[PDB]
Design a binder for this molecule. Structure first.
Ligand SMILES: CCCCCCCCCCC(=O)OC[C@H](COP(=O)(O)OC[C@H](O)COP(=O)(O)OC[C@@H](COC(=O)CC)OC(=O)CCC)OC(=O)CCCCCCCC
Ligand SMILES: CCCCCCCCCCC(=O)OC[C@H](COP(=O)(O)OC[C@H](O)COP(=O)(O)OC[C@@H](COC(=O)CC)OC(=O)CCC)OC(=O)CCCCCCCC
Ligand code: HEM
Ligand code: HEM
Ligand SMILES: COc1c(O)c(C)c(C/C=C(/C)CC/C=C(\C)CC/C=C(\C)CC/C=C(\C)CC/C=C(\C)CCC=C(C)C)c(O)c1OC
Ligand SMILES: COc1c(O)c(C)c(C/C=C(/C)CC/C=C(\C)CC/C=C(\C)CC/C=C(\C)CC/C=C(\C)CCC=C(C)C)c(O)c1OC
Ligand SMILES: CCCCCCCCCCCCCCCCCC(=O)O[C@H](COC(=O)CCCCCC)COP(=O)(O)OCCN
Lengths: 126, 352, 431, 55, 352, 126, 55
């Protein structure tokens, strides 16, 4: 339950730094390949937990062409683990395709919930 | 940019922005209705939630309204907070967001509720039909959105770029200093809008006569007639609309509503008879058309019409009819007809 | 604006506006439905429609005159409107309808047709207009066996037994110069009105109206009118509030603005800064609500009305609403008090600075009749700006905390629980 | 909704002893079943405290 | 009582009872539809359940059917069980119960399902409108029940006493011995019915021309025309209806349906164009009316029409058109028009 | 759970008999007055139990003018007992009004359910 | 409907051990909670039968 606004606050400071982005980016590329979600046919944004209102809002607003493809990747993954096998090497997700398709819908649901709380418990200038 | 304002010593101010963007200029059926329900949503800088909360602490409210000629953005507020509300209405016309989830979650459900409550009224269904058979493609376009023709998000954005232009809007103020208003409008995004073109046409519309329609409906029954009116005859029909609803006439107990809708290039007279029993509706409408064909003398209702015409012209910019002096008589010629309800027991046009 | 009152035997009030294009002249009497008995309930509603009948209105429309009238609990009104340069004819018409010749209007043919027209209005009201008839039943159980319970239109059972003699008796006792105010609004000068009245030697009737035995007394009670054929539930609920000429008049009005009004189908009404809306919108418990603070000569009412289609979650709506009322005594924020100050001033500005001279004639006459003068709008704004958070808590702990209630309902109200489950929600006691 | 109606454990208590619909005309003969629930609690408690000393 | 029958060496027999009780004789709108859905309910002697179970063990079924001219009671069964089915149809016309709970539980829900599936078809809505504007009160009455006019249980019973009479019905049999049928009909309750009056009128109906109507609808778009036909011209329009749907014509790919409905005193020609896109519908209907106004030669389609007219006259009692010999030419005169759907993008009558 | 068809089979044999209808009818009139349902404002057909399908069918088919009056008699009766009182002597049900308004709807629901069972378990003549 | 769905007592058994929806991919580590229910039945039953002979 660390917010995504905070994750990107830290991450964009690392990436726009010359000296920091050459010691932690190679480390982070080996961390993703050893995890092994790409071998089950999954992108990272499929792994995010969705039993909360900010993630239920982002999924309603996702386009349906991208929503139908997400449900097939999740069903195919439950079946691949049920058999204790991996998929063929030509059906793995590649690095070009491992894009954050759901991040932009999440950040706008978070910025609006924070704006509401700041207004619901504000004190007046007078 | 025509800025105009009247001053007064009161507490409350009113500011309006009128756009020639009504349903008679619609490219698709119902696109002027979805732009109207889209106003005062999120902009590129300020959210819709923040606008409601900020203005509540200053004492103000916003709304938007649609008719066949205009879309009108209005603000009602306390006098000394003028420059905040000039810049809010300007961001609506300039930098509105047009995001897909606002169409799905807010705009389309609100347009659906507007249509559902209007379809239950038979007098409104009859009025929409009289506009369609008298004028076919301009003024006769439908007002609201029903889903017959499909309207996308890009159609709403392309309509907005057509009607939100410097040469196609007016700004008006009530209890507002005019020198202050003209200064705040120049240092605003209203002056940065595109200088496009006015959509108004000084040509008179084309009209039709001798038409007829019938519609089945569960509920009460209606019988309505319509007459198109040119610019030079508007006063003769304004006296008629008031004389028939007045106690001076014999037919006032037989008539539910009679009015004249006024435009910049003519208007439409309308009359309505309404009752649950369908034998009452048929016998009353027959007596009205036989009496108007003989003729009436409208001279006792001239002074009564001058009063009523000033009561409805309190704070509007006043199309002027100083023609009530030369009104004596009227007799009915050709007209159009609509019937709604138990249409098997209602009369036809050739028997009226 | 600025008002001006005089007394030359007749009380004349005026509120000039040089910007108006019309002028209204009329007379307001200080008697209404609360000065009647159950036998003649509706006799003031018949005088309205006799004044607006067709043969009387035809005489007015030939000179360019329009008529209006309004019946309420504490007053009655009869207005004539005209163009600004025709206000001398307005007074003559009013002379031959009240001071002289109100027997041509009470002929046999004019009274039977008028009666039949009023019996049909009150019948359609009791069968189609559900929000307004539930609020009438609230006044009828809250003030039962007192004058403030009677409906303003009358009932169908008391209207049928009214004859001409009942109309003439009620006029001799109440249409008196001691009980009357002559008003003028719009484009009319104060001195031109009084000199026109002095040039005629008018006098309606002298004075000393009846005494009115009983006072108004609030009783905690309920009335249920169940009808399972209708598609909604309509409910109203109130406590005892403030009368006019009370010190807490504007504090009660401000506390109703904190919770305010709601429409579920308007998008901007879902975004109001009202904490109650975070509970209602999760399961959509209602379609609309509105909070009121009503005030009369002897008592008042404070509460809300609602309409809904969720006939299985009625108890959660009533529960959540009454838990917010408790916060006015315990925990109410300074932000909530400053929002309500600004919107109340906007609400009072629209009521008193509308364009219609007919609405301004009704407000002026009722105020002068009940306190002798009219308070300015600039003085009312200063009182509103001087209300603190401590003033709201003192008012609520007296009027809301652990106090009796009045309830009325109609429709699908099977899910509305008993009195004592609702009475208990008026005090927190988790505290 | 209220917490007593949304919580898994309080929902059972609410449905049985708070919001349960009852006929208005039942008399005092309908009170014997609650007493039998108190009797069973008395016996189980007193017997357990004696069983610590029994042989 | 006109009894008629043909014999044959087959296994299955068919028995029909036709009544002049269609919608063109209805006293209220939709009363012929509720009498039709009421047939084969409980009688005063036998229940509806017992009738279904008894006839299943003998091998037979019943049904009732409504059109604008007839109500028809039909039975299909094995040849040797004739006298059981003559007495079952006679109890339906004589001693039906008409109990209130059958209207509430069976009859009204079935009439509501019939109306719901017909309102989704735009070609059926257009056909109902062409009948109403061409004939106003007789043939133009609505077929089904929609609840606009309220019909009570006593209205259904008073209609039945009007149309179930000895002089207003026919009996027909297929694969039935006629001497056996005529004997079982005389010893039946059919002979005990009231000897009333036939409702047929040899007067030709009154018709109208040059009418127009438009209806908004979500879905596909339709454009239809109608022409009334007298008795002496039925064959000229029967060849036209077949020539336009045939491969002999150029316009067959532009036309969805064309037919001629035949009655005892004339008929109605109809034509339909249908498509989802509204620019296709407008361009096709315009090309059809320009071609028929020039004129056509119908002589190559005479032999093709004799075949088709015998294929539809297999086991019906055969209105005879031996007039196909003198058919050469046709050119279009005046006609009526209906449009259904996206009526803002469809043409008007004066531009066809 | 004795059927109403059987009750009337026995009863109509007693009533149409001269000697039997003079010893059991006076006995049955004192049995109804000592029961006391007429003093609570109830007719006998209100007392019949209704938790079965043949009685649910009869109540759907009852006209609504008679159905609205039945619900008021039942509510008024529950309230007269919570207070341990009887109604005034001029609000009691009289013998003229104590009519079987629901019996005819019951007998036709019973004759149809019996007809169905005889057909569902019939054996064929062949 | 089936009798196991309409009866007050069998409806609970059906909802928990017959028709309960389960994810298809759960492994044998999800079988330990059923064993703990067998352990409790073993421990309680064997204890009653020893308690008849204990002092
Ligand atoms: C040995 C272990 C026993 C311990 C448990 C004791 C509980 C036994 C209760 C048995 C019973 O249920 O009999 C109920 C019956 C009352 O029936 P009802 O509802 O119509 O009367 C409502 C009342 O009028 C309102 O009475 P109210 O509600 O106003 O106050 C009740 C209060 C008595 O109030 C008074 O001062 C006198 C009116 O307290 C009680 O009554 C306590 C309850 C007994 O009682 C009667 O009075 C008449 C029946 C006599 C029963 C004797 C046979 C049993 C052996
Ligand atoms: C006293 C109670 C006894 C039972 C307690 C232990 C049971 C639960 C242990 C979980 C387990 O099954 O071990 C698997 C574990 C992690 O691997 P995983 O979860 O990805 O795959 C599971 C897949 O469904 C196997 O099952 P599979 O789908 O591969 O085939 C069925 C298998 C049946 O075998 C069994 O009965 C297992 C209980 O077929 C056969 O073996 C046929 C015989 C020739 O990898 C291991 O092998 C670790 C062994 C356990 C070590 C920890 C305990 C030591 C204290
Ligand atoms: C429904 C619940 C119970 C009932 C009806 C019940 C009944 C009885 C009775 C009638 C006696 C003999 C009383 C005498 O004359 O001394 C008794 C004795 C005893 N019971 Fe219970 N019992 C119950 C629950 C329990 C429980 C749960 C225990 C737990 C250990 C318990 C422990 C004992 C003991 C130790 C004695 C012997 C001591 C004595 O005589 O009082 N009882 N029980
Ligand atoms: C969760 C259930 C239980 C657990 C975990 C448990 C555990 C134990 C353990 C660890 C011992 C000592 C074993 C030894 O070294 O001898 C014991 C003894 C004993 N327990 Fe249990 N017990 C359970 C249930 C019960 C019950 C319900 C009873 C009585 C009905 C019971 C009766 C006894 C007796 C009589 C002994 C002494 C005899 C012996 O040593 O085996 N137990 N228990
Ligand atoms: C009709 O309306 C009603 C209604 O009126 C009522 C009352 C109820 C509720 C009715 C009841 C009878 C409640 C049920 C009561 C029980 C099931 C009794 C259960 C009692 C126990 C399980 C005993 C628990 C006791 C202990 C654990 C003893 C504690 C002892 C200790 C701590 C001593 C420590 C020392 C040693 C040696 C152990 C309804 O459900 C209901 O329906 C809607
Ligand atoms: C995830 O999917 C599952 C799931 O897989 C399972 C298995 C279950 C069921 C799981 C369980 C663990 C079952 C629960 C079992 C208990 C709570 C055990 C409690 C009962 C006992 C321990 C029995 C007690 C025994 C007695 C009272 C009698 C013993 C004494 C005797 C027989 C002596 C009698 C005397 C004489 C003289 C013969 C689920 O509920 C479930 O969720 C949907
Ligand atoms: C047949 C056996 C009896 C079965 C139970 C029926 C009788 C009811 C038991 C008595 C009711 C008391 C329950 C406590 C109510 C609060 C529960 C709660 O807050 O739920 C939980 C927290 O509860 C706990 O921590 C453990 C409960 C301990 C149970 C004590 C024995 C809150 O969870 P919540 O519903 O708010 O949603 C998740 C939000 N984080």
């Amino acid at each position: 339950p660390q917010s995504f606004t905070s994750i990107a606050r830290i991450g964009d400071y690392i990436l726009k730094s010359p000296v920091l982005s050459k010691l932690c980016v190679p480390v982070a590329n080996q961390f993703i390949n050893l995890a092994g979600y790409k071998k089950l046919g999954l992108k990272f944004d499929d792994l995010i937990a969705e039993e909360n209102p900010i993630m239920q809002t982002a999924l309603r607003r996702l386009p349906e062409d991208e929503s139908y493809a997400r449900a097939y990747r999740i069903i195919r993954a439950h079946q691949t683990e049920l058999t204790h096998h991996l998929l063929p090497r030509n059906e793995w997700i590649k690095a070009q395709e491992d894009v954050p398709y759901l991040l932009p819908y999440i950040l706008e649901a978070e910025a609006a919930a924070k704006e509401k709380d700041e207004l619901d418990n504000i004190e007046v200038s007078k | 940019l025509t800025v105009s304002a009247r001053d007064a010593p009161t507490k409350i101010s009113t500011l309006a922005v009128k756009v020639h963007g009504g349903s008679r200029y619609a490219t698709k059926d119902g696109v002027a209705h979805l732009l109207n329900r889209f106003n005062f949503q999120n902009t590129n800088t300020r959210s819709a939630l923040k606008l409601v909360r900020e203005s509540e602490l200053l004492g103000g409210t916003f709304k938007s309204t649609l008719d066949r000629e205009y879309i009108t953005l209005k603000a009602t507020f306390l006098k000394d907070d003028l420059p905040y509300y000039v810049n809010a209405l300007a961001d609506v016309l300039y930098k509105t967001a047009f995001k897909p989830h606002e169409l799905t979650e807010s705009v389309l459900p609100a347009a659906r509720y507007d249509y559902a409550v209007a379809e239950q009224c038979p007098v409104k269904s009859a009025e929409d039909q009289l506009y369609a058979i008298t004028f076919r493609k301009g003024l006769g376009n439908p007002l609201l959105y029903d889903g017959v023709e499909r309207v996308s998000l890009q159609d709403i954005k392309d309509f907005a770029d057509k009607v939100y232009t410097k040469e196609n809007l007016e700004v008006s103020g009530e209890n507002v200093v005019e020198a202050d208003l003209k200064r705040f409008v120049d240092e605003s995004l209203l002056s940065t809008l595109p200088a496009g073109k006015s959509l108004v046409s000084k040509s008179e519309p084309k009209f039709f006569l001798g038409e007829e329609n019938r519609v089945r409906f569960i509920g009460d029954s209606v019988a309505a007639i319509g007459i198109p009116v040119n610019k030079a005859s508007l006063a003769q029909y304004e006296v008629l609309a008031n004389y028939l609803t007045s106690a001076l006439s014999e037919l006032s107990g037989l008539i539910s509503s009679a009015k004249l809708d006024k435009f910049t290039d003519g208007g439409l007279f309308t009359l309505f008879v309404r009752d649950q029993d369908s034998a009452v509706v048929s016998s009353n409408i027959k007596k009205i058309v036989a009496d108007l064909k003989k003729g009436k003398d409208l001279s006792p209702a001239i002074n009564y019409t001058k009063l009523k015409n000033a009561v409805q012209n309190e704070s509007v910019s006043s199309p002027i009819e100083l023609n009530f002096d030369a009104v004596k008589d009227f007799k009915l010629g050709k007209f159009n007809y609509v019937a709604v309800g138990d249409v098997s027991n209602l009369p036809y046009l050739d028997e009226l | 604006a600025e008002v001006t009152q005089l007394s030359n035997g007749i009380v004349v009030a005026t509120e000039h506006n040089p910007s108006a294009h019309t002028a209204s002249v009329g007379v307001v009497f200080g008697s209404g439905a609360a000065n009647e008995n159950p036998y003649n309930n509706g006799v003031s509603n018949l005088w309205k429609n006799i004044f607006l009948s067709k043969e009387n209105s035809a005489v007015a429309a030939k000179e360019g005159l329009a008529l209006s009238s309004n019946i309420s609990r504490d007053f009655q009104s009869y207005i004539v409107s005209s163009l600004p340069g025709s206000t001398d004819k307005s007074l003559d018409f009013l002379n031959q309808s009240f001071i002289q010749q109100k027997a041509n209007l009470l002929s046999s043919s004019n009274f039977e047709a008028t009666k039949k027209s009023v019996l049909k209005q009150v019948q359609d009201f009791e069968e189609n207009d559900h929000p307004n008839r539930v609020l009438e039943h609230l006044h009828s159980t809250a003030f039962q066996n007192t004058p403030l319970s009677l409906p303003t239109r009358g009932t169908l059972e008391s209207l049928e037994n009214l004859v001409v003699a009942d109309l003439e008796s009620f006029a001799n006792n109440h249409f008196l110069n001691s009980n009357a105010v002559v008003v003028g609004t719009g484009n009319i000068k104060h001195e031109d009105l009084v000199n026109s009245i002095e040039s005629k030697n008018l006098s309606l009737q002298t004075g000393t109206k009846p005494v009115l035995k009983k006072k108004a007394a609030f009783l905690g009670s309920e009335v249920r009118l169940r009808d399972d054929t209708l598609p909604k539930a309509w409910i109203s609920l109130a406590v005892e509030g403030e009368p006019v000429n009370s010190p807490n008049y504007f504090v009660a009005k401000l506390a109703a603005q904190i919770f305010g009004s709601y429409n579920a189908f308007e998008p901007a009404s879902r975004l109001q800064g009202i904490k109650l809306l975070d509970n209602i919108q999760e399961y959509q418990l209602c379609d609309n609500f509105n909070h009121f603070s009503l005030s009369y000569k002897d008592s008042g009412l404070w509460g809300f009305s609602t309409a809904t289609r969720n006939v299985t979650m009625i108890d959660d709506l009533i529960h959540f609403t009454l838990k917010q009322w408790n916060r006015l005594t315990i925990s109410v924020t300074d932000t909530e008090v400053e929002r309500a100050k600004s919107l109340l001033k906007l609400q009072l500005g629209q009521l008193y600075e509308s364009g219609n001279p007919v609405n301004d004639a009704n407000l002026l006459g009722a105020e002068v009749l009940i306190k002798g003068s009219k308070l300015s709008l600039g003085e009312a704004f200063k009182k509103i700006d001087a209300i603190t958070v401590k003033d709201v808590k003192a008012w609520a702990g007296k009027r809301l905390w652990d106090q009796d209630i009045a309830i009325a309902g109609t429709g699908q109200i099977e899910g509305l629980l008993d009195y004592m489950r609702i009475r208990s929600d008026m005090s927190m006691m988790r505290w | 909704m209220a917490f007593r109606k949304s919580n898994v454990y309080l929902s059972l208590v609410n449905s049985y002893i708070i919001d349960s619909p009852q006929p208005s005309s039942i008399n005092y003969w309908w009170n014997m079943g609650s007493l039998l629930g108190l009797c069973l609690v008395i016996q189980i408690v007193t017997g357990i405290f004696m069983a610590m000393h029994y042989s």
